[model samples]
Target chain A: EKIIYFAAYVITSVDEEMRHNELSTLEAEMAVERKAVEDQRDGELEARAQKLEADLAELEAEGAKADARRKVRDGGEREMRQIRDRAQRELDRLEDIWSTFTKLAPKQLIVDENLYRELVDRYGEYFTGAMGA
Target chain B: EKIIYFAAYVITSVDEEMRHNELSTLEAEMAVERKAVEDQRDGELEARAQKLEADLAELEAEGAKADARRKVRDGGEREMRQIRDRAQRELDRLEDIWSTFTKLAPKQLIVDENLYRELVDRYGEYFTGAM
Candidate 1:
């Protein structure tokens, strides 16, 4: 099982290397994200929607939650804006949870010799990634 | 099981509610994040780390990476700073993956009734929040 052992060792080394590189990448990304949480990006989007889409939709839909929208049609832009906004907020909260979670994220490298062999045999493109750009 | 279905339904609803709220939350958060990314936060952190942690450590260690990082130090401030920065970046990429993953994230409300009732009768605190 020398082959397996070697494969596992290589994988462990690769994993550690990847983990080390990732730390720098993650730190930068998190700093960016931490700002986003502080900035509350979606709130501004809401502001924009209200300014831009609100009157258009009300003028069009003239209704509330379950009301079929009215028909002075402008291609559903206003209504779609709200949906987009909702999508944003949904993602933001998800991001927030992820930020804290990633702060102490553990080593996630799997050391399967077979898996490594499969990758080595099959995925040369991965190695061509400038070895970590 | 009827009990299981009901429990599943409640969980689904709760999940939906949380998801909906989260969408709004994420939108705000991402907007903020997008800006920070655009702003380049950590590059700035690198600047701060350099200014703050530099000279002080260089004076003492005279350059030591595991060369007696074994002991004798100013509580490992400078080395730890870069180390901490690395740790942060690693996690952040993870978050990046997770954020995209979550965007397309599927339903998490599993329908195991035993698990549900266990939570229901056993963990009253969950409902106590607002229910």
Candidate 2:
């Protein structure tokens, strides 16, 4: 009985030592796995964040280009309108002068018949130019 | 000695069962931890991606609006140039008419002096308007 007890104790002690070693190994493995998972997560997130930022920069640059075009179009609109208005006023003045000239003198009161005929021809030329074809 | 061996065997069986239960608990805990970490990673990445998409959408919308305005300005340019050209041509014709009329008849060739004086006055008015 004494020998059997001694043998059993020895086996238990050996098993305990084996279990302790296994536990230590498992803990170390768990730590490594956890660190690996953390590293993967951090790396993926960082790479994704950087990709998003690069996309943002490209989008912002496109927006700036669009904005610049819009500004140029706006400025061109102002200039074109101003030119159109000035030209229109000039046309109105011309029409007013021509109308006054036609009504100023009657055809019978004209003394120089040759000069008057040429004046009528000049008026006709003006008409053809102002009204297309 | 038989009784001692039997007791040792019984104790070993009990310890084996306890260790099995401990191992199962540890496995459950590890599974739970891994799932939690995966869930957290997915949630964070999903939220950030959504935010970035929203920002991109806003910029694209702004670009569309700018393009629309540019189109309007482009069309307006064509119309304005056409009108300006027509007006310029009209003014040129008026100038030509007045210039020819002035050189056509002189003061010495006047028969109806009153009418001739009115024609001279009309030509002066045209000059102020055109020149």
Candidate 3:
């Protein structure tokens, strides 16, 4: 019984570390990466759009340059929005798990409750992995 | 083609940071956690085994106590081996993936090669998840 209890404690500790520390760090990096992508995409569109507008002066094709600018802006907005949504979804997924683990991370219980049992069931791969580790 | 190129860049950048920084950090912590478990488990067994030996002193059950001690040693060794093996496998899994990512981590690729396409196909969930 005590050994199982110890095993249970080790399992929870591992989960706490994974969720709070590991996942949290990864999520934070992802946030940075997403913003960097957004900035780079917008900058690329702006530069291309500017170059196209400049061609209006040399080529006397005003409408074509305007059309190019519009297309680039629309393409950038479409792509940026998708990227932002994916980032948000990823963040939300991380935060949701964080909430569950954070609530239980405090106590050093024997951990036989259904809440933890369900977690063990849900993350059996990790628990068994924790054991073998 | 360019959008895909940009998308590919984004994907590899995400993976690069994940492996170089995030997984590296987690794996280090895992190593620490493993050592902690080893020390804590050994200390626990020592304390309990001592108490059991002390109980033999009180009850004058030397032979029985010796048998119990032997059982405890044998049981601990077996369980400890299993636990160590699990930890090793987990580390190995992480390290193996790390090797794959490390090779691709350096260059600022347009990421159009078959290796990346296969990466996109193999890890489509993350690629899409990445997208």
Candidate 4:
């Protein structure tokens, strides 16, 4: 019975480590995907920023027609802001999924260890009772 | 032989999926850690920026002593720049580790599949010849 418990503990520890390693590997891959998404968003933001700046420059070159320049710049700014907000939302969504996965990662390992301990304990009790009888 | 190959293929596919899932989980954890690091760095940068602004205000209030103020402001700016650069480098290093892990992610799965196939093929040939 004691040996059984010892073995069980060892196995559970190994299993836990295995699960942890697996989760760690997955986290690394997700990071790659996350980076890709972020890079894409950053690229889009840069383009939008450049476009807005160009628009502002053109307006300035137009002899600073205050009202018209202001209107055009405002429109450009609004569009840029919209793009940024959308990108931010997407990034947030990805982060949420990533967070959820991390939070649930150890659950299976915990369940496995608990079950193993219960089984070993029950078996130990059964064997001990049989021997005593 | 055919059965061996089929079984091996099935095992390989399952292993691949399992490995992928594992990597995904780890990636998520790393993301959390990365975020923590970034948040810490951001907080530092914000504090530094605020301090610099305060310094700028004090200098401006001192009647704009150009030479003295420039020296002070330059020192403050340099320190801020160094912090930003260090943070950026740390971020880059984390990204590199993430990239390396991603790149090597499927390697074990591929190796297992290949070995399975080779062993099955060799065993099939041996058994058939003996028969």
Candidate number achieving the greatest TM-score relative to the actual structure: 4
DockQ of each: 0.03, 0.02, 0.02, 0.15
Give one digit per residue, the lDDT tens place, for model 1 in A1-133. Answer: 3333333312212233554566545444545554554356556656665655665667556555433433323345555566667666755654543432333222323244444344445332223211221
Measured against the true structure, the TM-scores of the candidates, in listed sequence, are 0.25, 0.19, 0.25, 0.35
Better candidate by lDDT, 3 or 4: 4
Better of 1 and 2 by lDDT: 1
Best by lDDT: 4
Better of 1 and 3 by TM-score: 1
Q: Model 3: share of native contacts present?
A: 0.00
lDDT by residue (tens digit), candidate 3, A34-93: 444445655766775566556444445444566766666576666656656765675565
* Candidate 3 CAPRI assessment class: incorrect
lDDT of 1 at A63: 51
True lDDT of residue A109, candidate 2: 34
Runs in model 3 with CA error above 4 Å?
A: A1-133, B1-65, B105-131
Clashing pairs in 2: none
Residue B15 miss distance in model 2 (angstroms): 40
lDDT of model 2, residue B39: 56
